[PDB]
Design a protein around this nucleic acid. Structure first.
Ligand SMILES: [Mg+2]
Ligand SMILES: [Mg+2]
Ligand SMILES: [Mg+2]
Ligand SMILES: [Mg+2]
Ligand SMILES: [Mg+2]
Ligand SMILES: [Mg+2]
Ligand SMILES: [Mg+2]
Ligand SMILES: [Mg+2]
Ligand SMILES: [Mg+2]
Ligand SMILES: [Mg+2]
Ligand SMILES: [Mg+2]
Ligand SMILES: [Mg+2]
Ligand SMILES: [Mg+2]
Ligand SMILES: [Mg+2]
Ligand SMILES: [Mg+2]
Ligand SMILES: [Mg+2]
Ligand SMILES: [Mg+2]
Ligand SMILES: [Mg+2]
Ligand SMILES: [Mg+2]
Ligand SMILES: [Mg+2]
Ligand SMILES: [Mg+2]
Ligand SMILES: [Mg+2]
Ligand SMILES: [Mg+2]
Ligand SMILES: [Mg+2]
Ligand SMILES: [Mg+2]
Ligand SMILES: [Mg+2]
Ligand SMILES: [Mg+2]
Ligand SMILES: [Mg+2]
Ligand SMILES: [Mg+2]
Ligand SMILES: [Mg+2]
Ligand SMILES: [Mg+2]
Ligand SMILES: [Mg+2]
Ligand SMILES: [Mg+2]
Ligand SMILES: [Mg+2]
Ligand SMILES: [Mg+2]
Ligand SMILES: [Mg+2]
Ligand SMILES: [Mg+2]
Ligand SMILES: [Mg+2]
Ligand SMILES: [Mg+2]
Ligand SMILES: [Mg+2]
Ligand SMILES: [Mg+2]
Ligand SMILES: [Mg+2]
Ligand SMILES: [Mg+2]
Ligand SMILES: [Mg+2]
Ligand SMILES: [Mg+2]
Ligand SMILES: [Mg+2]
Ligand SMILES: [Mg+2]
Ligand SMILES: [Mg+2]
Ligand SMILES: [Mg+2]
Ligand SMILES: [Mg+2]
Ligand SMILES: [Mg+2]
Ligand SMILES: [Mg+2]
Ligand SMILES: [Mg+2]
Ligand SMILES: [Mg+2]
Ligand SMILES: [Mg+2]
Ligand SMILES: [Mg+2]
Ligand SMILES: [Mg+2]
Lengths: 93, 46, 271
RNA sequence: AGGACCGAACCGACUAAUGUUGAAAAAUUAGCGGAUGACUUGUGGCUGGGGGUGAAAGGCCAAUCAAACCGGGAGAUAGCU
RNA sequence: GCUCGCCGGAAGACCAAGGGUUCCUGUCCAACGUUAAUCGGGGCAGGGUGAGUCGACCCCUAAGGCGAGGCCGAAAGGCGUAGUCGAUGGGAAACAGGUUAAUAUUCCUGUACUUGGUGUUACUGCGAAGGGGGGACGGAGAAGGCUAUGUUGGCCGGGCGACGGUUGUCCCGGUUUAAGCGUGUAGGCUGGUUUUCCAGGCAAAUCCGGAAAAUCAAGGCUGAGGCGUGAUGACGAGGCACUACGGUGCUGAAGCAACAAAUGCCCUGCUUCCAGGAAAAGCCUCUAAGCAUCAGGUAACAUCAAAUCGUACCCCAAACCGACACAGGUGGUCAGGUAGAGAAUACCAAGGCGCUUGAGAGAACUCGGGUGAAGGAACUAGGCAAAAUGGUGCCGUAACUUCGGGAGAAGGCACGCUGAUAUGUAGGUGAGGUCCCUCGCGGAUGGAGCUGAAAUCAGUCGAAGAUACCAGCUGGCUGCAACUGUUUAUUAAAAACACAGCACUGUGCAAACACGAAAGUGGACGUAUACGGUGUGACGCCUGCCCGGUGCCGGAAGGUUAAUU
């Protein structure tokens, strides 16, 4: 069992893009932004408890932040974690 | 032609990395000198 | 067997090889094998301390029983074998209780022969006895210098020691060098000569054959500059000085033994 | 069988021409040598400066070598310009 | 978009290293791009990297590193034991099809596999930091069996030709399918099983090693590929209906055989040689302490788990190393057609490009090439450069020689195409049918079909048949070095260095010697048939006289002589 406070912390934002929408349509997959240290098990538990849907698998990747030149100064956006959450064909979250 | 710098990340870290500096008192003195100068990058580590 | 190669190429013209038909053609006895990597003449400071060492063939170390301290259990010779680590051949013997060992193969020893160690061993080649029990005049090899230490003298191919005298607790030995030395009578010796006496009749034939044995080229002192050898320098071939080592010690006749601890045991120098 | 032979890859570098504020702070083109061996190559490791390493040219040791580079003694000293 | 040209053992494809967003989309053209730029690896913005099986991480060790105590050293520190790290090596498991603008062995579809934790059942001796087996290993060579792959035929669909012919012996295109599971083959190694005993494997062992008998004569291990299933699936040339002209989607025939064939596989095999060819764990097994109807082990079924990190893109290059969008450098894998010995070379396929200034003109001169009357080294320091030779088969080949060589010495002849021998020969491959049996992926016979040199004869074209690319100049005398090698990275490749061989000399092992204030380490887990130093330098014939000088070795009567007293 993972604690409720952790589950409330792990999920960050739903990722909005056309690939995410195609995932939602074709494969019944939602794409979320999660915490950099959120494991697959915590993501699954948090989606089930917080979105009240049945999950069978999650897929994760880490996005590298880009380098941006702002006013000739060099900066780098933060890395973030993204989850492909497959709902088991009966939920429609 | 073949030039003098032929990069290897493992060899770089083993030669000049943070742990290699810490392993001897002379390397620790290198680190003290660089800290006192105010260097942003102490070693080649990152 | 000493056979000369036919001059079908310039590197083969002068090759003379020693081929022993009796030697085992298979793999060595595995549980009696240990690995040993090469040092290149480098010590633990990583410096060359002995020049002209490096490369050559990979070799596995064979554990050879120089002590010969299974007294009273007879052993039978199974097969002769090639040992890369030494000039002599070795013999894999099987003991009556099931123990297998490697020994230095004496001259004449072959598969099926019986060997035995201990004080009551029969006087025949390949048998080990204390030199108390070995008559004056016997030819022996693998001689111990201290009781229980293991044979240390006369181990190369075709070598042997002559027992010249026995007085008190010491025997007087005649060494290959010609030196007459005293060793304790409790020290063990093996009857007979070391085998492979034809080993000195080999001719390597070419530089590569010396390289196969881990020997790197020797560079003469007079061929280099004075900064790195006392023999160096000159406009053309010039010498004009007494020969010395790379470190300046005279190298034609000057004596280097300095051991007052073991001087008492040396009956006469090799001359 | 062979430090065997001819010959690509691969390792090299004998001749000539070009180039010489170069396409290149050592190359290009045509020829040239070795090409199962004392061969060649990847990865990692060891040897540190009067020290290493050298099939030995005072060669090589990060385009630096009859004593590396960096900092310090240091504003060395300069009857010289 | 149509032509043209270039690479194609790469200038195509995929990786590792290294780089780090350069990847895809929209938008902009100041600066950057050696010119313009609407374009870009440029500016700006958004998007994009999905894993139980790939890799890391992880288990295990090599060189080597560090190193509790320890030994040593003015301090700083050096070495090293038990240990603990350290891949470039060993160790569990996934394939095919489809899909995005950009990811895929990761998503989807289908079909699989590995290891672990639990739960129940049934049988049941479980247990190591220890014993043993195994893992587990070289170079070279030879042959057989295969496969990737290609070619042809058959089969299916389509065509009847911009100019003479083209319903045929014509033309074009396709003809594909994995892991897994079942089988246990070509072939490789090895005799089994069962009793009793034992100076061995630190203790013990039924395990390994040894010894003595019986009995039987076939058991065991390994093993490419084929076949069957996987698969009535998928894919599939082409047809059809829209289009945003990029593509969306539906349907979809045949999908076979023969022959050739690797540098890949059987093969960590076999034969042979000397220079004699990792370690440790996983794994199998054996027990000791111990527990002892418990635990734990095994077999079946169920169920749960397999985390984390990497994954875009370049990768012989405009993205890495070279200050550059630099004719340089950069490890591994893949390997089609015709000709060819070939991974040479020429022309092509798949695929990728025309190298980021162009337009004219058609002077000298420079660069890189083509040809040249007569002469033919007269050039020059010198035949420098250039010209020339160049293949295969057969004939033929001197001095000298260490008998191997020299030698491809030199020199010469044949060489295309067509027909015949022989409607395709000798050879290779091998089906149907028949016969046998310890019955099958069997033995023997039979040879259809397929594939296919070399030669001889006759004829025939051209100036020329090894016609292009490609591809030795040869010979005579002589110095030096025996020879293959090595060297002044970047003006010297040699006669210099090395070398096998020879000799002198030191060294008795706690060796001499070398690196170290030292402990230690190398020499060497070597032992005088060994190791170090020095000179000479294959081999043949040889290597003379001098010990006055210097060195070294040996001697100790006498002279001299330190600290000390
Ligand atoms: Mg030597
Ligand atoms: Mg020598
Ligand atoms: Mg010189
Ligand atoms: Mg000197
Ligand atoms: Mg002279
Ligand atoms: Mg003189
Ligand atoms: Mg050769
Ligand atoms: Mg040659
Ligand atoms: Mg060239
Ligand atoms: Mg060659
Ligand atoms: Mg000089
Ligand atoms: Mg340099
Ligand atoms: Mg100096
Ligand atoms: Mg001063
Ligand atoms: Mg000054
Ligand atoms: Mg003056
Ligand atoms: Mg950018
Ligand atoms: Mg782009
Ligand atoms: Mg403009
Ligand atoms: Mg511009
Ligand atoms: Mg851009
Ligand atoms: Mg992942
Ligand atoms: Mg998944
Ligand atoms: Mg080690
Ligand atoms: Mg300590
Ligand atoms: Mg240490
Ligand atoms: Mg470890
Ligand atoms: Mg590795
Ligand atoms: Mg892609
Ligand atoms: Mg085939
Ligand atoms: Mg090959
Ligand atoms: Mg990729
Ligand atoms: Mg350019
Ligand atoms: Mg380039
Ligand atoms: Mg290369
Ligand atoms: Mg080519
Ligand atoms: Mg072409
Ligand atoms: Mg012109
Ligand atoms: Mg010209
Ligand atoms: Mg011409
Ligand atoms: Mg002319
Ligand atoms: Mg003429
Ligand atoms: Mg003429
Ligand atoms: Mg003239
Ligand atoms: Mg003239
Ligand atoms: Mg010429
Ligand atoms: Mg020419
Ligand atoms: Mg002359
Ligand atoms: Mg020579
Ligand atoms: Mg040569
Ligand atoms: Mg060179
Ligand atoms: Mg030079
Ligand atoms: Mg040169
Ligand atoms: Mg020692
Ligand atoms: Mg000489
Ligand atoms: Mg000479
Ligand atoms: Mg003389």
């Amino acid at each position: 069992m993972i604690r409720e406070e952790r589950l409330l912390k792990v999920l960050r934002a739903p990722h909005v893009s056309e690939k995410a929408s195609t995932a939602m349509e074709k494969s019944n997959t939602i794409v979320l932004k999660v915490a950099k240290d959120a494991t697959k098990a915590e993501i699954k538990a948090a989606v089930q408890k917080l979105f009240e849907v049945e999950v069978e698998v999650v897929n994760t990747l880490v996005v590298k932040g880009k380098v941006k030149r702002h006013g000739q100064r060099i900066g780098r956006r933060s890395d973030w974690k993204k989850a492909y959450v497959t709902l088991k064909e009966g939920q429609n979250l | 032609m073949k030039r003098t710098f032929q990069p290897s990340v493992l060899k770089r870290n083993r030669s000049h990395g943070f742990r290699a500096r810490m392993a001897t008192k002379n390397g620790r003195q290198v680190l003290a000198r660089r800290r006192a100068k105010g260097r942003a990058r102490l070693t080649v580590s990152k | 067997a000493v056979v000369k190669c036919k001059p079908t190429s310039p590197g083969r013209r002068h090759v003379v090889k020693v081929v022993n038909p009796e030697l085992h053609k298979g793999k060595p006895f595995a549980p009696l094998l240990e690995k040993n990597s090469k040092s290149g003449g480098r010590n633990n400071n990583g410096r060359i301390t002995t020049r002209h060492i490096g490369g050559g063939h990979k070799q596995a170390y064979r554990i050879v029983d120089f002590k010969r301290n299974k007294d009273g259990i007879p052993a039978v010779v199974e097969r002769l074998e090639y040992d890369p680590n030494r000039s002599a051949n070795i013999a894999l013997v099987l003991y009556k209780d099931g123990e297998r060992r490697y020994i230095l193969a004496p001259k004449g020893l072959k598969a099926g022969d019986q060997i035995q160690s201990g004080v009551d061993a029969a006087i025949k080649p390949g048998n080990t006895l204390p030199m108390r029990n070995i008559p004056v005049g016997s030819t022996v090899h693998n001689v111990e210098m201290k009781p229980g230490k293991g044979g240390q003298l006369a181990r190369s191919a075709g070598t042997y020691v002559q027992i010249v005298a026995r007085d008190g607790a010491y025997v007087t030995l005649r060494l290959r060098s010609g030196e007459m030395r005293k060793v304790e009578a409790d020290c063990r010796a093996t009857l007979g000569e070391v085998g492979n006496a034809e080993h000195m009749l080999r001719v390597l034939g070419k530089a590569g054959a010396a390289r196969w044995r881990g020997v790197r080229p020797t560079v003469r002192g007079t061929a280099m500059n004075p900064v790195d050898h006392p023999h160096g320098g000159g406009e053309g071939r010039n010498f004009g000085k007494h020969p010395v080592t790379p470190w300046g010690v005279q190298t034609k006749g000057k004596k280097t033994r300095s051991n007052k601890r073991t001087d008492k045991f040396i009956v006469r120098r090799r001359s």
